[PDB]
């Protein structure tokens, strides 16, 4: 009919690079999730992926407020009896910052095949260097 949905073949995916130094995790993750889902484009379609690629550098410099550095705890469960594993943000940001960003953005993306497709477009690196110079990403601040 007259309201047309975006065709996946016709979608273009740009590449942006973001520095995470001295930024709040949640308020950065909201913008990251928005851009990954594609809400910023006027051709937004709920059943199609129209987002852009987002590279995150300096991930270990991400900050939290209050006492959350010591008090925010991350959990997982091995399906063995009594197998609950428990850690802290201070240790997790030192060990696997990519896990920090992955959890933060997964919590905000939809839960399904399309959400799994969208999350693959986020690239997270601890250092200030990334291996995608061939894609010529543009600087984006959010």
């Amino acid at each position: 009919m007259k309201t047309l949905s975006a065709k996946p073949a016709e979608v273009q995916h740009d590449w942006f690079v973001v520095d995470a130094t001295g930024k709040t995790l949640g308020r950065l993750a909201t913008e990251i999730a928005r851009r990954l889902r594609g809400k910023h484009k006027t051709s937004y379609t709920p059943h199609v992926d129209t987002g852009d690629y987002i590279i995150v550098i300096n991930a270990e410099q991400v900050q939290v407020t209050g006492n959350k550095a010591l008090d925010k705890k991350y959990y997982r469960h091995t399906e063995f009896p009594g197998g609950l594993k428990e850690t802290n943000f201070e240790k997790l940001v030192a060990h696997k910052p990519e896990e920090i960003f992955e959890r933060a953005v997964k919590g905000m993306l939809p839960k399904g095949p399309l959400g799994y497709a969208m999350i693959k477009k986020m690239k997270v690196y601890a250092g200030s260097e990334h291996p995608h110079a061939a894609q010529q990403p543009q600087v984006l601040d959010i």
Binding site: K2, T3, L4, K39, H40, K41, T42, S43, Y44, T45, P46
Partner: protein, 118 residues
């Protein structure tokens, strides 16, 4: 006389339900008892969805208009107010179509809305 055999009419009635149950999985397209329930539930779902569709499409139009307005440096909520104060009566469906297919016209509408707001 007045002894009535029922096979022909019963067969016709069952065949109509089976024909309406085309495409369903397993017994839902083969067994009359299962097929009959499937058709009624499909009717109920269709009755509810004829109402749900308007809500979903209005939400889609609002999302597209919001994207266009923020691209032009304004929010959806303020753009609606600006257009209403400018006395423009273009509806959300047409606004979303313009946002999707013609950036210059939507920019003109946004300029008019912000001018009315000022």
């Amino acid at each position: 006389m007045a002894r009535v055999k029922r096979g022909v009419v019963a067969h016709r009635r069952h065949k109509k339900i089976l024909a309406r149950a085309k495409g369903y999985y397993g017994a839902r397209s083969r067994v009359y008892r299962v097929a009959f329930q499937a058709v009624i539930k499909a009717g109920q779902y269709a009755y509810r969805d004829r109402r749900q569709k308007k809500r979903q499409f209005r939400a889609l139009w609002i999302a597209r208009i919001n994207a266009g307005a923020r691209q032009n440096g304004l929010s959806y909520s303020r753009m609606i107010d600006g257009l209403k104060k400018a006395q423009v009566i273009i509806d959300r469906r047409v606004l979303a179509d313009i946002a999707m297919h013609d950036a210059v016209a939507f920019a003109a509408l946004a300029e008019k809305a912000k001018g009315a707001l000022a």
